[PDB]
Amino acid sequence: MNKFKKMALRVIAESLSEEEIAGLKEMFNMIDADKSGQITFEELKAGLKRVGANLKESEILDLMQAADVDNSGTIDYKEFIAATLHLNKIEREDHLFAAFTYFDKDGSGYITPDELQQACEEEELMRDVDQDNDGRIDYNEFVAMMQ
Numbered sequence: 348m349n350k351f352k353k354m355a356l357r358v359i360a361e362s363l364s365e366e367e368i369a370g371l372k373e374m375f376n377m378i379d380a381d382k383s384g385q386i387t388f389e390e391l392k393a394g395l396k397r398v399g400a401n402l403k404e405s406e407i408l409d410l411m412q413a414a415d416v417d418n419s420g421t422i423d424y425k426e427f428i429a430a431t432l433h434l435n436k437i438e439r440e441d442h443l444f445a446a447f448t449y450f451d452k453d454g455s456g457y458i459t460p461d462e463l464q465q466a467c468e469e470e471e472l473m474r475d476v477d478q479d480n481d482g483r484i485d486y487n488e489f490v491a492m493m494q
């Protein structure tokens with residue numbers, strides 16, 4: 348069974364599109380705030396909410412411990428991807444994150460008006476979408492727009 352389960356997880360991972368992969372990479376980088384290549388518990392607690400999940404602290408610790416299979420005390424990129432496949436709340440958003448990272452041309456984590464204009468080669472916009480008035484659209488505001 349566990350074998351079959353592992354086989355299914357591999358199918359899912361292999362079935363991710365390259366655009367979904369780029370989205371997951373942006374998610375990872377968003378959480379890995381110091382760009383160290385490794386996500387710590389502190390980063391995970393600060394960052395999960397930004398990628399649309401915001402679990403309870405105890406739930407985040409459970410995720411951290413399950414994902415950290417080499418007991419590094421950190422989540423690396425490969426561990427992160429594997430983990431998203433075990434958390435519906437996150438993996439269900441892979442397509443939305445693919446779309447967000449497409450608009451977020453510079454991988455800044457926020458869509459700016461200039462990026463909006465770049466995309467429209469494809470600004471009442473900002474008023475209804477930018478809910479916190481920082482002049483940028485973050486992932487959560489993007490999801491809310493999509494609804």
Ligand SMILES: [Ca+2]
Nearest residue numbers: 379383385386
């Ligand atoms: Ca880090």
Ligand SMILES: [Ca+2]
Nearest residue numbers: 415419421422
């Ligand atoms: Ca690890």
Ligand SMILES: [Ca+2]
Nearest residue numbers: 451453455457
């Ligand atoms: Ca940006």
Ligand SMILES: [Ca+2]
Nearest residue numbers: 477481483484
């Ligand atoms: Ca904003």
